[PDB]
Amino acid sequence: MIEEHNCFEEFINTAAIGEQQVYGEYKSKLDSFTDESKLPYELLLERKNLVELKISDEEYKKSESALKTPNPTLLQKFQINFYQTIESINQVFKPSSSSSNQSSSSSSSNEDDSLQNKKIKVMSWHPQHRLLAVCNKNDVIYIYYFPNQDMYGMGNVRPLTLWFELQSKVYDIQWKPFLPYTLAVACENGIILWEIDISDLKVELKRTSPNYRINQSSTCANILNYPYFLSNTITWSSNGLQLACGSTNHSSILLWDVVSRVPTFIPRYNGNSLLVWSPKNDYLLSCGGKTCRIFDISKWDYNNKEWPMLTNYQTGSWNGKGEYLAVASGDRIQFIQCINRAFESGGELMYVEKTSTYRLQNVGGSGGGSSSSELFLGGHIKKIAWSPDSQRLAVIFYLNSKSRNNDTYCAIYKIKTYPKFSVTPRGFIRSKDQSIQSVSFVPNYKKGSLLSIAYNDGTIKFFPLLYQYKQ
Amino acid sequence: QYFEKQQIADYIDKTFEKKIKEWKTWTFSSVFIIFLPLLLFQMLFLSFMFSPSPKSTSTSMISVILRTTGNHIFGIILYVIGQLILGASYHSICSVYRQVPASFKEQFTVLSIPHLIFITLNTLIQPLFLYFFFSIPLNKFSLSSIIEVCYQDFSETIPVAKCELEYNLFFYLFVLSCIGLVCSGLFRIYSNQEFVYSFPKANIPTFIQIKSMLYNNFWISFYTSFYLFFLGSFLLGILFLILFKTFTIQILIFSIKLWCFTFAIIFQNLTRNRLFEIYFTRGLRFTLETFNSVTFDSSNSQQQQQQQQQPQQQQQQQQQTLFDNKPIIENGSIFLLKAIYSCDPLIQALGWKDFLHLSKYSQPRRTYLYREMSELLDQPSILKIIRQYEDQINDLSLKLSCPREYYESLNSGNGNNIEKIIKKTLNFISGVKFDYNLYECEIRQALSNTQSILWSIESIGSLIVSAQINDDRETMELLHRYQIPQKFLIPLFQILALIDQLEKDLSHQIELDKFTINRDYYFLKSFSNLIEPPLNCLGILKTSRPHFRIFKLVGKNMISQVLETIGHQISDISFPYDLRTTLNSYRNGEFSIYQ
């Protein structure tokens, strides 16, 4: 058997209390500070470079000539109402699900509403080049380009602002791995592919492109709609030419050829609540209801193997070689080795870390008037992300019914994949009671790994994880 | 003995086309092995649904079926023979190579003898299918265009049977709906090119492909039979309000049978034809296993224990091939090379579709071909497959760099009112200008066949990248020593420059016509549920421009996938000067899909 590890429970004594913060990993630690004047110089210098990105709460105010849809004719409005009549009949011929379980089926509709109602919905990095795409409350996408390999000077970077009439209720966003620049955006109207030009990202090349006299852009919003498939999640292929798309309402993966714009359907009972492709390899994670599957893309089978999950929600990340896969649901992270002999057996389990809803006792020194705040941490996981170097995992939580601050902390683990697999916690990143929406690492950072954290207030903040390399 | 280097070649020829001819005939058989059970299920279903209901004797459902079918056995045999004949004459018009017509003349004058045989066989057999379905039910149909109607004249003191002569309403309905079946089936096949095989873009297993095909064919047959049926019954129903001023309810009861029979015929043709597409576009494998094997499908149990005795099994296999009088074949790649160098475009498209399975998913076939280059052999099969890719970029380039003025001078050195009516009526009905440029048509003839070249581009880049991804060094220093990154990038840069040129040159000819804003008749298309799976992975596309994107988004992706893995080992010294600037745009990521 493989056991339940509580390694998270030891290091809770590092979680920065009260007006303390944690500003980055340094010399393999996450020690806490009230004040940035007291940081180690190596981390203070990085924090003078790593500008905090404040996103606008604005609506893209519609101009006159913006490409409005050809307002659907009296017969297309008849066709929409007639298909909604056929589908509401098919919703009566779907066998009614057990509404005895309403108290664990009203969460996802409110998880969706909570996504659409935030200042930041989704943020997505390109996996090699330093491009950050971020969707705001009003379905405006801001793309930030960052040329400098150590991020000096960033205080006036104006983002390329992508908006279109069918960019409404964005659910998920992923960059194409290989170039030319392409951003996939999942919305209520299907999927938008922004096929993007370099001169709208390098203003310098907008002096030397022949279109400069015309000022026009070749950056164009193409669309991959299949009727009555709502894309709730999306992931690109390990070669950039295909896109795998998931729906909570459809019992299929929708896999597109992005070159010839052709859809294919792969049968997936329990729908898709998560999709994640292996960043170098022919392997796809698909989660749906309470099962996950790992598919062999050379055959489109999963060797009949279904991995069990605790909640209807799942979050997951491969490592930067794609050898290993982390999958989190409930109080837990399952760590699977995909790439071994084990792929005939559908991948093998290596470790199970357990983020229970544990407790601090605040160690009350003699200030005998101060409120004895009972902090609780861990519990139900909200997102995981693995570093490109494969050495770190960043983990954020939902609000446990004991603790008001439970999403203001990001738990950091160090991972080693050879000569034996292991996980070791390092501590908790926190800024002063800002609650976290999302986490991601930044591509091709030299000094260890660079973590980006998006907060519910509209800010993205940076946290360098300075690796003590050896000489 | 020795065998001569030419006798070993001759053995490999007489093995290669034999295995291909055995595969072609087995694959042809496999379509009918699946189509005939589906036909028999439908013929049984229709023989139940159009039986009169039995009186309350406990005769079993099977004993009713055996008594309707038992009177009709010769017609069921003729019907099956007609479905075999329309499968053979369909397979005899199937291709992988596409032809574009430069005008509405060639779309009928370039129809080679098999297409004329397919047209004539459909024109004769589809009406005979409809007649057989009208012959199953105990309501006697007639093909007499007239009927004797014996009414009893009660004006005499003996009530005389008086016979006066009516026109057979149901014969004219049958003739009009036979024309409706033949014309719609043939128009669709020659307007959508449903004889050019659509290759599946993912390796999804054939049972799931056939399950999807049967569901898509069901709805597409349901709406196409419905439109033919309702338009025919409405136009003909207006004729009864004009001529006879009366609407006989027997017309509706004939019409509801007619729809179920036109539906069956359309579904049967679509299911026959799309089973050939699924079975011939299925990836083959070209290995020493698939070609040297005897099909001895019985010994499956003994594999487990033999692993520990390798060298004595090799000596016993050598003693066995001597007893087989087989040459050894040391080149394990030769049957894939002969697929790539194949003058059959189906075998070449399957060869590149196996080189694409090698390059991504088949590490032991890669490590064999890598070692084929460190074994220092006279000409290794990687360089021979690179040559058929160099050849195929040149064979495309020489058909794109051909000047417009050659085609427009050809238009200067080479009925009528009916044709101008047909074109003006087709432009109106179709939402297409059937109004052509020769230069834009032959750029489309070159580009619309490129699916071999798009897979050789995907494969050589995937093979190069599938050295560096292993933490391997031997294959990487061999790939550089044979200049394989250079030979993958130089012709690919040159033909991408030509396609970033020809998209501009033809851009000035592409009016954003305020009707080419294609509302692709959304009334008829969505009042049907003709949510078509988008036409055949390139059908006849209405312009050149979508083909330029299809080539550029493969090429510019596969360049990035090589440079963002190996572009820091490639020195610009190893490129022509004209390509050193181009190499740095592609290394820096300073490029897009459209200029």
Task: Please tell me whether residue A426 adopts helix, strand or coil conformation.
Answer: strand
Instruction: State how far the Cα of A443 lies from the Cα of A386, in Å rounded to an integer.
Output: 12
Gyration radius of chain B's alpha carbons: 31
CB-based burial label for B158 (10 Å; 0-12, 13-18, 19+): exposed
- In this complex, do A239 and B360 lie within 8 Å of one another by their Cβ atoms? yes
Residue reference for tokens 């307007």 = B191
Asked if A390 contacts A319 with a C-beta cutoff of 8 angstroms, the reply is yes
CB-based burial label for B137 (10 Å; 0-12, 13-18, 19+): middle
Q: Phi/psi of residue A64, each to 5°?
A: -70, -45
| A194 closest CA partner among A160, A245, A156, A153 | A160
CB-based burial label for B527 (10 Å; 0-12, 13-18, 19+): middle
Instruction: State how far the Cα of B35 lies from the Cα of A303, in Å rounded to an integer.
Output: 29
Residue B543's CB: how many other CB atoms inside 10 A? 13
Find the distance separating the first CA and the last CA of chain B, reported in whole Å: 64
Q: A454 CB contacts (<8 Å, ≥6 apart)?
A: A120, A123, A134, A436, A437, A438, A439, A460
Asked if B360 contacts B558 with a C-beta cutoff of 8 angstroms, the reply is no
Asked if A399 contacts A406 with a C-beta cutoff of 8 angstroms, the reply is yes
Beta strands in A388-469 (DSSP E): 392-397, 410-416, 422-429, 436-441, 448-455, 459-466
Residue reference for tokens 């799931």 = B208
Closest by Cβ to B360, choosing from A261, A262, A282: A282
According to DSSP, the residues that pair with A349 across neighbouring strands are: A336
Q: Number of Cβ pairs closer than 8 Å across A and B?
A: 116
Instruction: State how far the Cα of A41 lies from the Cα of A334, in Å rounded to an integer.
Output: 37
Asked if A240 contacts A208 with a C-beta cutoff of 8 angstroms, the reply is no
Closest by Cβ to A79, choosing from B454, B526, B590: B526
Instruction: State how far the Cα of B251 lies from the Cα of B170, in Å rounded to an integer.
Output: 8
CB-based burial label for B190 (10 Å; 0-12, 13-18, 19+): middle
DSSP string over B416-464: THHHHHHHHHHHHHHTS-----HHHHHHHHHHTTTHHHHHHHHHHHHHH
CB-based burial label for B141 (10 Å; 0-12, 13-18, 19+): middle
- In this complex, do A262 and B553 lie within 8 Å of one another by their Cβ atoms? no
Instruction: State how far the Cα of B161 lies from the Cα of A344, in Å rounded to an integer.
Output: 83
**A300 contact B CB<8A:** yes
- Crossing angle of helices B545-566 and B484-505, rounded to 10°: 150
Closest by Cβ to B592, choosing from A70, A197, A297: A197
What DSSP character marks residue B52? P
Contacts of B593 in chain A (CB under 8 A): 180, 195, 218
Counts for chain A of helices (H) and strands (E), in that order = 4, 30
Asked if A427 contacts A108 with a C-beta cutoff of 8 angstroms, the reply is no
**A454 contact B CB<8A:** no
Q: B585 CB contacts (<8 Å, ≥6 apart)?
A: B591
Compute CA B486 distance to the chain's CA centroid, rounded to the nearest angstrom.
Answer: 35
Asked if A240 contacts B562 with a C-beta cutoff of 8 angstroms, the reply is no
Asked if A191 contacts A185 with a C-beta cutoff of 8 angstroms, the reply is yes
Asked if B346 contacts B276 with a C-beta cutoff of 8 angstroms, the reply is no
Q: B174 CB contacts (<8 Å, ≥6 apart)?
A: B130, B131, B134, B141, B143
Asked if A212 contacts A225 with a C-beta cutoff of 8 angstroms, the reply is no
**B207 contact A CB<8A:** no
Counts for chain B of helices (H) and strands (E), in that order = 23, 2
Instruction: State how far the Cα of A144 lies from the Cα of A141, in Å rounded to an integer.
Output: 10
Compute CA B429 distance to the chain's CA centroid, rounded to the nearest angstrom.
Answer: 26
Q: B198 CB contacts (<8 Å, ≥6 apart)?
A: B277, B281, B536, B537
H helix or E strand, kind and range, residue A124: strand A120-125
Q: Which chain A residue's Cα is nearest to B470?
A: A321
| B78 closest CA partner among B117, B135, B38 | B135
What DSSP character marks residue B415? -
Q: B110 CB contacts (<8 Å, ≥6 apart)?
A: B99, B101
Q: Phi/psi of residue A320, each to 5°?
A: -70, -20
According to DSSP, the residues that pair with A293 across neighbouring strands are: A286
Torsion sign (Cα): B433, B438, B439, B444: positive
Q: Which two tokens stand for residue B323?
A: 């007893």
Instruction: State how far the Cα of A136 lies from the Cα of A56, in Å rounded to an integer.
Output: 7
**B245 dihedral zone (left: phi>0; alpha: psi -120 to 50; beta):** left
DSSP string over A210-263: GGGGT-----EEEE---TT---SEEEE-TTSSEEEEE-SSSSEEEEEETTTTEE
DSSP string over A357-374: EEEPPP---S-TTS----
Task: Please tell me whether residue B71 adopts helix, strand or coil conformation.
Answer: coil
A407-413: list long-range contacts, CB under 8 Å, 24+ apart: A407/A382, A407/A435, A407/A436, A408/A433, A408/A434, A408/A435, A408/A436, A409/A15, A409/A377, A409/A436, A410/A436, A410/A439, A410/A451, A410/A453, A410/A463, A411/A8, A411/A355, A411/A377, A411/A378, A412/A25, A412/A30, A412/A451, A412/A465, A413/A353
Instruction: State how far the Cα of B384 lies from the Cα of A315, in Å rounded to an integer.
Output: 46
Instruction: State how far the Cα of B170 lies from the Cα of B153, in Å rounded to an integer.
Output: 26
What DSSP character marks residue A98? -
According to DSSP, the residues that pair with A141 across neighbouring strands are: A135, A162
Q: Which two tokens stand for residue B215?
A: 């569901």
Residue reference for tokens 């992270």 = A333
Half-sphere exposure in the Cβ direction for A8 (13 Å, CA): 29
Asked if B134 contacts B261 with a C-beta cutoff of 8 angstroms, the reply is yes
Asked if B41 contacts B313 with a C-beta cutoff of 8 angstroms, the reply is no
| A193 closest CA partner among A130, A242, A144 | A242
**B458 contact A CB<8A:** yes
Q: Which two tokens stand for residue B226?
A: 């419905």
Q: Phi/psi of residue B87, each to 5°?
A: -80, -45
Instruction: State how far the Cα of A442 lies from the Cα of A440, in Å rounded to an integer.
Output: 7
CB-based burial label for B27 (10 Å; 0-12, 13-18, 19+): middle
Instruction: State how far the Cα of A204 lies from the Cα of A121, in Å rounded to an integer.
Output: 31
Asked if B276 contacts B94 with a C-beta cutoff of 8 angstroms, the reply is yes
Half-sphere exposure in the Cβ direction for B382 (13 Å, CA): 30
Instruction: State how far the Cα of B332 lies from the Cα of B338, in Å rounded to an integer.
Output: 12
**A210 contact B CB<8A:** yes
CA angle centred on B362, ends B358 and B366, rounded to 5°: 70
Q: Which residues of A325-358 are buried (b: 16+ CB within 10 A; e: fewer)?
A: bbbbbbbbbbbbbbbeeebeebbeebbebbbbbb
Alpha helices in B281-309 (DSSP H): 288-292
Q: B390 CB contacts (<8 Å, ≥6 apart)?
A: B487, B491
Q: B226 CB contacts (<8 Å, ≥6 apart)?
A: B259, B528
Asked if A357 contacts A376 with a C-beta cutoff of 8 angstroms, the reply is yes
Instruction: State how far the Cα of A273 lies from the Cα of A286, in Å rounded to an integer.
Output: 8
Compute CA B381 distance to the chain's CA centroid, rounded to the nearest angstrom.
Answer: 30
- In this complex, do B357 and A298 lie within 8 Å of one another by their Cβ atoms? yes
Torsion sign (Cα): A333, A337, A339, A345: negative
According to DSSP, the residues that pair with A255 across neighbouring strands are: A244, A264
Torsion sign (Cα): B354, B355, B356, B362: positive
Q: B3 CB contacts (<8 Å, ≥6 apart)?
A: B11, B327
**Structural biology method used:** cryo-EM
CA angle centred on A177, ends A328 and A47, rounded to 5°: 70
Contacts of A242 in chain B (CB under 8 A): 201-202
Task: Please tell me whether residue A321 adopts helix, strand or coil conformation.
Answer: coil
Compute CA A118 distance to the chain's CA centroid, rounded to the nearest angstrom.
Answer: 15
Instruction: State how far the Cα of A266 lies from the Cα of B203, in Å rounded to an integer.
Output: 11
According to DSSP, the residues that pair with B150 across neighbouring strands are: B163
Q: Regarding beta strands A410-416 and A392-397, do their DSSP bridges make them parallel or antiparallel, or are they unpaired?
A: antiparallel
Instruction: State how far the Cα of A230 lies from the Cα of A224, in Å rounded to an integer.
Output: 11
Asked if B185 contacts B122 with a C-beta cutoff of 8 angstroms, the reply is yes
H helix or E strand, kind and range, residue B237: helix B206-243
CB-based burial label for A188 (10 Å; 0-12, 13-18, 19+): middle
Asked if B62 contacts B44 with a C-beta cutoff of 8 angstroms, the reply is no
Return the amino acid letter for B1.
Answer: Q
- In this complex, do A260 and B208 lie within 8 Å of one another by their Cβ atoms? no
- Crossing angle of helices B363-374 and B345-361, rounded to 10°: 90
- In this complex, do B522 and A259 lie within 8 Å of one another by their Cβ atoms? no
Cis, bond preceding B345 (omega within 30 deg of 0): no
Closest by Cβ to B531, choosing from A70, A227, A264: A227
DSSP string over A293-306: EEEETTTTB-TT--
Contacts of B553 in chain A (CB under 8 A): 180, 241, 258-259
Contacts of B594 in chain A (CB under 8 A): 195, 197, 218, 220
Instruction: State how far the Cα of B285 lies from the Cα of B500, in Å rounded to an integer.
Output: 35
According to DSSP, the residues that pair with B461 across neighbouring strands are: none
| B101 closest CA partner among B440, B418, B346, B345 | B440
Residue reference for tokens 């941490």 = A377
